[PDB]
Design an enzyme around this catalytic site. Sequence first.
Site, PDB file in Angstrom:
ATOM      1  N   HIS A  41     -11.327   5.801  36.823  1.00 24.92           N
ATOM      2  CA  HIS A  41     -11.970   6.675  37.799  1.00 24.92           C
ATOM      3  C   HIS A  41     -13.178   7.428  37.232  1.00 24.92           C
ATOM      4  O   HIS A  41     -13.847   8.177  37.946  1.00 24.92           O
ATOM      5  CB  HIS A  41     -10.955   7.640  38.462  1.00 24.92           C
ATOM      6  N   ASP A  85      -5.212   2.764  35.774  1.00 25.21           N
ATOM      7  CA  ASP A  85      -6.400   3.593  35.622  1.00 25.21           C
ATOM      8  C   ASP A  85      -6.930   3.512  34.191  1.00 25.21           C
ATOM      9  O   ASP A  85      -6.748   4.421  33.365  1.00 25.21           O
ATOM     10  CB  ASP A  85      -6.022   5.027  35.999  1.00 25.21           C
ATOM     11  N   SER A 176     -10.013  13.942  32.367  1.00 26.37           N
ATOM     12  CA  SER A 176      -9.811  12.541  32.731  1.00 26.37           C
ATOM     13  C   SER A 176     -10.331  11.554  31.697  1.00 26.37           C
ATOM     14  O   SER A 176     -11.457  11.691  31.211  1.00 26.37           O
ATOM     15  CB  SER A 176     -10.526  12.225  34.050  1.00 26.37           C
ATOM     16  N   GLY A 177      -9.510  10.562  31.377  1.00 24.22           N
ATOM     17  CA  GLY A 177      -9.926   9.539  30.435  1.00 24.22           C
ATOM     18  C   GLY A 177      -9.745   9.921  28.980  1.00 24.22           C
ATOM     19  O   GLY A 177      -9.911   9.086  28.091  1.00 24.22           O
TER      20      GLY A 177
END
Length: 221
Positions: A41, A85, A176-177
């Site tokens: 994402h 993801d 995120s990530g």
Amino acid sequence: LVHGGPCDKTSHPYQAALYTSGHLLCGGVLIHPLWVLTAAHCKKPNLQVFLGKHNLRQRESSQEQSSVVRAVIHPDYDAASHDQDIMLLRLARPAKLSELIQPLPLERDCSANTTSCHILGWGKTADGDFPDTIQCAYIHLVSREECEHAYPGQITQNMLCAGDEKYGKDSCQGDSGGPLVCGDHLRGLVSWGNIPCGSKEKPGVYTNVCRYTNWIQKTIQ
Ligand SMILES: [Mg+2]
């Protein structure tokens, strides 16, 4: 990351900062001189990758920048459910290593028992603001049964839950990530979770990295 504190300056050599339009968008993990692993994402056009960063508001002697020449999103990534993801970013040139820039090995065994782990990132903090200094916090893996209980019918085999029942330390927007590190190996990637951030009741959900050893290997080699 909420309820944590500033990381030690030499404790996150594998941490990448992903930028777009001049602002941080996500974290990432250097796993090979030419590759940064992150969440699917986090895909945006013109991503900029920064390694060796600690304080975003200070020019650091150790920082290195790189453009992305190829972004490989997992073929089965689902942006609604967050399933699979994960995304690999190929750097224009291999990263120059030092005490502040180093790759982190992947956890290949899904049954690894090191349940005490830590998360890190420049995402939103408890005060609702985004920090200049990268934040760190220790949390614990949660059994799949409890994970499923917290998010009924939403947890897949490609997801791993982790949280802190004591203070609710948790990852957040902007993290995120980034890495969920257990026993010096990458166990997960910040994917999704409770909003507002906090893991006392609902644990954070991370991409289950051990499930992707084969996909990552094939993509890189
Ligand atoms: Mg699908």
